[PDB]
């Protein structure tokens, strides 16, 4: 459905004539990654965020332009991955665990 | 949610302009009947003309509201008295004044429409998002190791209690499922990007963690080693 | 903020009803045309 | 000057022309609205009788 | 007959209201077209003066 | 020759112009908006638009008291310095303010509702709409919660001249307490209301409030919790109503179509959408009974306008295009400019077992019937 919205919606012509229509993701502060599926774009965006090209707000807004409101769970991924790293740290230091 | 509230304020201002203009236009619509009667009668009748207490319409409250708004409530009694008493003198004056005020208000409304448009677009999309901000906290207190181990221990204790109740309690408390075999390669990709672009650990720690993750993931989930290579680098210098 | 607490008042004074010199003129015109009776 | 100055002139006339296009686009839609309202009122009065 | 007379008067009033509405729209649009032309003329003149200065 | 039957539709062009108070959540203006779309979808060619005959004093005191209606008909926003006893007695002044044209407003509402009842009594229609009506919170002795004259009671009384049983369905997010109190001890009108029961207005509606006297088992309450969605609502709505239609067997329905039960409302706290809300109306209509559909709540005017327009086009038997045609209030409907209201990601609190429990209880109660 993310792709069925990305590529299968048509504006209201009356508000196109009067100059009222503005779509987001055509205004974002940056550009969106292009791919064959949305999921790939989502992954590239998480990757950009983890790097530092994207802030938290821009990452969330891009997720909204992509998926709508069913992508809020992913607003924390960075933090989550951080915590996962911490686990490995302990598991990489227990001497008997090897 | 502050974004729903911004939307509600905007809708309130919109409504304000619209209600003033609409009431004024209804009154004008009334006067436009008496004017066109006036201009179609002899010159002596115009002097002996009077309007009843309801100005010839159905709903006097709108009309008195309009007049009090336009002329202030200090000069409105004079205008209503002269509109009832001698119409043929008082209707043209008031009608023209109302037309001028309508013109001005329409101009102002057309001026404000654009500012409101941009405010609405700035506030709108993150308003169907009640749970987007009430989650950066619950996820925290569900990612604490303390919470994890506490939950585990409570599960074990209540399951032992049910085991001593004579009930049927299974062996495992958690049942996870991993169907797609590729998502793990994607999580590996994320791991590698973090490790390289994390400002917390040292190069050798990332290296050890990378090799260990390679081995452990490839082995536990039974996914080919070769897929994990591009995302988990062996040398971090 | 100083901006939005200003556009609030700018909106508020929009409607504003008729002005003072204008109602004075309409009153003077009324009385004049009443003299012509 | 047949130069960058002419470019500024053309990017000003762009603004003017989009304004004019918006106004003449408003007008026709408003006249359609009015036509609808009045056809409504006419049929309504006849039916009420 | 009371009904017929009321209806005929209301139809006349409708026709005389449509005219006012249309003239209102036309005036509203003349204002904006004149404003656009005036503003653009002033902009071009001010730019010519600014370039000369 | 007389062909199909069309939907009668009551509208009075002055109704949009009454204004409660400075920042009051209730705006009659919204009905104007609905009409401006019904005109611009060219819907009016499938309806019969009728002007209501304003109701008088001797028509409003068939339910209310002479003192209350007299106070209504006499008060004005200026001379209310002399009515300070009456303000206390009649519950007027803070949530139900006294404004300009109060009595005229009430007469327009009640006149639309009584006119619809007379339309069904006469045989001229089988559906009748009146969006200015449906003020279901007004008591016989007082004003309560944005309402002053309870016109659903008057419609019901006028319906009971030739129909032996009447059913009143209420889907405003609140409890329709006036219309329950009126017909609480009788078995000729069955009321059924779905509402948020908790620390909520008005505070009544408990599941064990099912009538006294002869009206024992002839009131139905369905107390839900926050964030209910379209499928949960459908699961709890369709069984109850199916069994009411089976066992009570009415002859005329009054459907209140409040729309503060929609996602994003100013006061309500549910999570329905345009299709979830319209599901109820279509299901009720599918039974082929004389029906009245009145307004109700609704305090986000853009959502209310779009939903009531959709439901009007849906009662008329049409199918509206999802792009809004140019109308006088186009800038209220940004930024999609579509005929649709969308749900959100707020969290549901009505677990499956809760809904199963209350459905079972209510169906036993209704099995007590004939
Ligand atoms: K209810
Ligand atoms: K009952
Ligand atoms: Zn309500």
Show the 3-state SS of chain F. Answer: CCCCCCEEEECCCCHHHCCCCCCCCCCCHHHHHHHHHHHHCCHHHCEEEECCCCCCHHHHCCCCCHHHHHHHHHCCCCCHHHCHHHHHHHCCCCCCCCCCCHHHHHHHHHHHHHHHHHHHHHCCCCEEEECCCCCCCCCCCCCECCECCCHHHHHHHHHCCCCCCEEEEECCCCCCHHHHHHCCCCCCEEEEEEEECCCCCCCCCCCCCCCCHHHCCCEEEEEECCCCCHHHHHHHHHHHHHHHHHHCCCCEEEEECCCCCECCCCCCCCCECHHHHHHHHHHHHCCCCCEEEECCCCCCHHHHHHHHHHHHHHHCCCCCCCECCCCCCHHHCCCCCECCCCCCCCCCCCCHHHHHHHHHHHHHHHHCCC
- Cross-chain residue pair B20–C15, CB shorter than 8 Å: yes
State whether residue B198 sits within 8 Å of chain A by CB: yes
**Beta bridge partners of residue F47, listed in sequence order:** F7
How far apart, in whole angstroms, are the C-alpha atoms of residue F31 and residue E29? 29
Q: Tokens for A58?
A: 């821009």
Task: Report helix, strand and coil shares of chain A as percent, to nearest 5.
Answer: 55, 0, 45
Q: Which residues contact B24 (CB under 8 A, 6 or more apart)?
A: B66, B69, B70, B98, B101, B102, B105
Query: Which of helix, strand or coil describes residue A23?
Result: coil
For an interface test with F, which of B59, B119, B128, B133 has the most F Cβ atoms less than 10 Å from its Cβ?
B59
Among the residues of chain B, which ranges form H helices?
2-38, 60-71, 76-85, 87-124, 130-133, 138-141, 145-164, 183-196, 203-220
How far apart, in whole angstroms, are the C-alpha atoms of residue C11 and residue E47? 33
How far apart, in whole angstroms, are the C-alpha atoms of residue E9 and residue E2? 11
**Beta bridge partners of residue F222, listed in sequence order:** F194
Query: Which of helix, strand or coil describes residue C15?
Result: coil
- Cross-chain residue pair F332–B23, CB shorter than 8 Å: no
Q: Tokens for A3?
A: 């792709």
A23-32: burial string, b at 16+ Cβ within 10 Å, e else: eeeeeeeeee
Distance, CA F138 to ligand 3 centroid (Å)? 12
Question: Strands F7-10, F47-50: parallel, antiparallel or unpaired by DSSP?
Answer: parallel
Q: Which residues in chain B (1-20) have CB-CB distances under 8 A to chain A?
A: none
Q: What angle do CA B89, B93, B97 make, to 5 degrees?
A: 165
B83, B91 in Cβ contact below 8 A?
A: yes
**Min Cα separation D19/chain F (Å):** 19
Distance, CA F209 to ligand 2 centroid (Å)? 11
State whether residue D15 sits within 8 Å of chain E by CB: yes
Distance, CA F287 to ligand 2 centroid (Å)? 21
Residue of B nearest to F54 (CA): B58
Name the closest ligand to CA F213: 2
**Min Cα separation B120/chain E (Å):** 25
Q: Which residues contact F58 (CB under 8 A, 6 or more apart)?
A: none
- Cross-chain residue pair A88–B209, CB shorter than 8 Å: yes
Contact: chain D with chain C (3+ CB pairs below 8 Å) = no
Q: Please tell me which residue in F35, F64, F86, F137 is annotated as part of the active site.
A: F137
Q: Tokens for C36?
A: 């012509």
Q: Which residues contact F331 (CB under 8 A, 6 or more apart)?
A: A20, B14, B113, B116, B117
Size of interface B-C (CB pairs under 8 A): 43
How far apart, in whole angstroms, are the C-alpha atoms of residue D18 and residue F120? 54
Q: By C-alpha distance, which of F14, F306, A33, C14 is closest to B22?
A: F14
Specify the length of chain F in residues: 370
| C-alpha distances in Å from residue B59, one per residue of A2, B30, F18, F49, F68 | 53, 11, 10, 20, 22
C17 vs B contacts (CB less than 8 Å): 69-72, 101
Of A18, A22, A69, the CB nearest to F344: A69
Distance of CA F286 to the CA centre of its chain: 19
At residue F49, what are phi and psi to the nearest 5 degrees?
A: -85, 130
Q: Tokens for B147?
A: 């919470």
- Cross-chain residue pair B14–F332, CB shorter than 8 Å: yes
How far apart, in whole angstroms, are the C-alpha atoms of residue F5 and residue B58? 31
- Cross-chain residue pair B132–F29, CB shorter than 8 Å: no
- Cross-chain residue pair F101–B62, CB shorter than 8 Å: yes
Does domain F7-368 sit in CATH 3.40.800.20? yes
Distance of CA F48 to the CA centre of its chain: 21
How far apart, in whole angstroms, are the C-alpha atoms of residue F48 and residue F43? 10
Q: By C-alpha distance, which of F26, F305, A20, F333 is closest to B10?
A: F333
What region, left, alpha or beta, does residue F248 occupy, with left being phi > 0 and alpha being psi -120 to 50 degrees?
alpha
How far apart, in whole angstroms, are the C-alpha atoms of residue C29 and residue F91? 47
Q: What angle do CA C1, C5, C6 make, to 5 degrees?
A: 115
B36 vs E contacts (CB less than 8 Å): 16
| C-alpha distances in Å from residue B70, one per residue of B87, B91, E9 | 18, 15, 30
How far apart, in whole angstroms, are the C-alpha atoms of residue C23 and residue C11? 23
How far apart, in whole angstroms, are the C-alpha atoms of residue A6 and residue A8? 6
> D4-48 and F29-40 are packed helices; what angle lies between their axes, rounded to 10 degrees?
100
How far apart, in whole angstroms, are the C-alpha atoms of residue F279 and residue B18? 32
Q: Which residues of E touch D (CB under 8 A)?
A: 3-4, 6-7, 10-11, 14, 17-18, 21-22, 25-26, 29, 32-33, 36-37, 39-40, 43-44, 47, 51
Distance, CA F154 to ligand 2 centroid (Å)? 15
Query: Would you state the torsion angle of the CA atoms of residues B24, B30, B36, B38, taken in this order, to the nearest 10 degrees?
Result: -100
Q: How was this structure determined?
A: cryo-EM
B176 burial type by CB count under 10 A (0-12 exposed, 13-18 middle, 19+ buried): exposed
F52, F12 in Cβ contact below 8 A?
A: yes
Query: Which of helix, strand or coil describes residue A44?
Result: helix
D26 vs A contacts (CB less than 8 Å): 18
How far apart, in whole angstroms, are the C-alpha atoms of residue B62 and residue F145? 24
F49, F13 in Cβ contact below 8 A?
A: no
**Beta bridge partners of residue B44, listed in sequence order:** none
Q: Tokens for D21?
A: 């296009």
Q: By C-alpha distance, which of A82, A81, A38 is closest to A63?
A: A38
Instruction: Verify cis geometry, omega within 30 degrees of 0, for the bond prior to F202.
Output: yes
Q: Which residue has the tokens 């009570």?
A: F248
Q: Which residue has the tokens 């004074």?
A: C13
D19, F22 in Cβ contact below 8 A?
A: no
- Cross-chain residue pair E17–B32, CB shorter than 8 Å: yes
How far apart, in whole angstroms, are the C-alpha atoms of residue B173 and residue B170? 7
Distance, CA F176 to ligand 1 centroid (Å)? 6
Residue F64 designated active-site = no
For an interface test with D, which of F16, F50, F326, F327 has the most D Cβ atoms less than 10 Å from its Cβ?
F326
Q: Tokens for F60?
A: 């409003």
| C-alpha distances in Å from residue F183, one per residue of B50, B70, F216, F334 | 49, 47, 11, 43
Q: Which residues contact F287 (CB under 8 A, 6 or more apart)?
A: F245, F253
In a 13 Å sphere around the CA of D29, the CA atoms on its Cβ side amount to 19
A22, A55 in Cβ contact below 8 A?
A: no
Q: What angle do CA B103, B108, B109 make, to 5 degrees?
A: 95
Query: Which of helix, strand or coil describes residue A41?
Result: helix
Of C11, C17, C26, the CB nearest to B93: C26
| DSSP at A29 | S
B204 burial type by CB count under 10 A (0-12 exposed, 13-18 middle, 19+ buried): exposed
Specify the length of chain D in residues: 49
Name the closest ligand to CA F256: 1
D48 vs F contacts (CB less than 8 Å): 50-51
Q: Tokens for B182?
A: 């590729």
Question: Strands F252-256, F291-294: parallel, antiparallel or unpaired by DSSP?
Answer: parallel
Q: Resolution in angstroms, to 1 decimal, for this deposition?
A: 3.2
Within 10 A of F294 (CB to CB), how many other CB atoms are there?
26
Instruction: Verify cis geometry, omega within 30 degrees of 0, for the bond prior to F335.
Output: yes
For CA atoms F286, F289, F290, F296, the dihedral sign is negative
| All chains having 3 or more CB pairs closer than 8 angstroms to chain A | B, D, F
Q: Which residue has the tokens 């009649």?
A: F90
State whether residue B204 sits within 8 Å of chain A by CB: no
| All chains having 3 or more CB pairs closer than 8 angstroms to chain C | B
Q: Tokens for B85?
A: 């008493």
For an interface test with B, which of A47, A66, A77, A87 has the most B Cβ atoms less than 10 Å from its Cβ?
A47
Residues with CB under 5 A from ligand 3 (ion): F 172, 174, 258, 260, 297
F266 vs B contacts (CB less than 8 Å): 8
B65, B76 in Cβ contact below 8 A?
A: no
């Amino acid at each position: 459905m993310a792709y069925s919205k990305q590529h299968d919606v048509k504006s209201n012509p009356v508000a196109v004539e009067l100059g009222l229509v503005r779509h987001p993701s055509e205004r974002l502060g940056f550009a969106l990654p292009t791919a064959d599926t949305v999921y790939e774009q989502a992954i590239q965006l998480c990757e950009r965020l983890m790097e530092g090209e994207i802030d938290q707000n821009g990452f969330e807004d891009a997720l909204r332009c992509l998926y709508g409101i069913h992508a809020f769970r992913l607003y924390t991924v960075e933090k989550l991955v951080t915590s996962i790293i911490k686990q490995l740290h302990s598991v990489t230091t227990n001497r008997r665990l090897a | 949610n502050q974004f729903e509230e911004n939307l509600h304020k905007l809708e309130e201002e919109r409504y304000e302009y619209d209600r003033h203009i609409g009431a004024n236009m209804r009154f004008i619509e009334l006067l436009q009947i008496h004017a066109d009667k006036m201009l179609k009668m002899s010159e002596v009748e115009k002097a002996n003309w009077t309007l009843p207490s309801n100005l010839g319409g159905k709903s006097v409250s709108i009309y008195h509201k309009v007049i009090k708004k336009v002329y202030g409530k200090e000069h409105a009694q004079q205008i209503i008295e002269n509109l009832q008493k001698n119409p043929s003198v008082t209707i043209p004056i008031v009608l023209e004044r109302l037309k001028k005020k309508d013109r001005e208000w329409r101009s102002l409304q057309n001026h404000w429409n654009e500012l409101w448009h941009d405010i609405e677009e700035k506030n709108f999309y993150r308003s169907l998002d009640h749970q987007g901000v009430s989650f950066k906290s619950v996820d925290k207190k569900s990612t604490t190791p303390k919470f994890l181990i506490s939950e585990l221990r409570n599960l074990a204790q209540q399951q032992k209690v049910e085991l001593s109740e004579g009930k049927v309690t299974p062996s495992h408390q958690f049942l996870f499922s991993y169907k797609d075999p590729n998502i793990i390669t994607d999580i590996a990709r994320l791991f590698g990007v973090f490790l390289i672009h994390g400002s917390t650990h040292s190069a050798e720690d990332n290296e050890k963690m990378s090799n260990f993750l390679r081995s452990f993931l490839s082995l536990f989930f039974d996914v080919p080693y070769d897929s994990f290579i591009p995302y988990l680098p062996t040398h971090f210098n | 903020e100083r901006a939005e607490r200003d556009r609030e008042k700018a909106v508020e004074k929009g409607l504003s009803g008729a002005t003072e010199e204008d109602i004075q003129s309409d009153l003077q015109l009324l009385k004049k045309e009443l003299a012509k009776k | 000057t047949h130069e960058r100055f002419n470019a500024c002139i053309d990017l000003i006339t762009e603004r003017r022309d989009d304004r004019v296009r918006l106004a003449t686009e408003n007008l026709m839609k408003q006249l359609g609205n009015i036509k609808n309202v009045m056809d409504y009122v006419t049929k309504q009065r006849k039916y009420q009788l | 007959d009371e009904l017929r007379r009321s209806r005929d008067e209301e139809l006349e009033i409708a026709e005389r209201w449509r005219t006012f509405l249309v003239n209102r729209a036309q005036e509203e649009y003349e204002v904006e077209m004149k404003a656009a032309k005036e503003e653009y003329e002033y902009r071009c003149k001010t730019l010519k003066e600014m370039v000369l200065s | 020759g007389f062909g199909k039957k069309k939907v009668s539709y009551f509208y009075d062009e002055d109704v949009g112009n009454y204004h409660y108070g400075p920042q009051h959540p209730m705006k009659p203006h919204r009905v104007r908006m609905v009409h401006n779309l019904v005109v611009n979808y060219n819907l009016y060619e499938k309806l019969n638009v009728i002007t209501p005959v304003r109701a008088t004093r001797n028509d409003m005191t068939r339910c209310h008291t002479d003192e209350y209606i007299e106070f209504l008909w006499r008060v004005t926003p200026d001379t209310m310095e002399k009515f300070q006893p009456h303000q206390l007695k009649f519950n007027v002044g803070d949530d139900c303010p006294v404004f300009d044209g109060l009595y005229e407003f009430c007469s327009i509402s009640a006149g639309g509702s009584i006119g619809a009842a007379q339309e069904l009594n006469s045989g001229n229609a089988e559906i009748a709409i009146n969006w200015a009506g449906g003020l279901h919170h007004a008591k016989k002795r007082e004003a309560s919660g944005f309402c002053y004259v309870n016109d659903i009671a008057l419609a019901a009384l006028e319906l009971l001249k030739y129909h032996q049983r009447v059913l009143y369905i209420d889907i405003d997010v609140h409890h329709g307490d006036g219309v329950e109190e009126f017909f609480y001890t009788t078995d000729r009108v069955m009321t059924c209301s779905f509402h948020k029961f908790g620390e909520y207005f008005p505070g009544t509606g408990h599941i064990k409030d099912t009538g006294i006297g002869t009206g024992k088992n002839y009131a139905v309450n369905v107390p839900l919790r926050d964030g209910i969605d379209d499928e949960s609502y459908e699961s709890v709505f369709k069984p109850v109503i199916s069994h009411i239609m089976q066992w009570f067997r009415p002859e005329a329905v009054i459907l209140q179509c409040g729309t503060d039960s929609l996602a994003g409302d100013r006061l309500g706290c549910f999570n329905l959408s345009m299709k979830g809300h319209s599901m109820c109306v279509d299901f009720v209509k599918s039974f082929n009974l004389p029906m009245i559909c009145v307004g109700g709540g609704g305090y986000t005017v853009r959502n209310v306008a779009r939903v009531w327009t959709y439901e009007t086009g849906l009662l008329a038997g049409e199918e509206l295009d999802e792009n809004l045609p140019y109308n006088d209030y186009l800038q209220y409907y940004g930024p999609d400019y579509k005929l649709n209201v969308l749900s959100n990601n707020m969290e549901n609190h009505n677990t499956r077992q809760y809904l199963d429990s209350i459905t079972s209880e209510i169906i036993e109660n209704l099995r007590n019937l004939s």
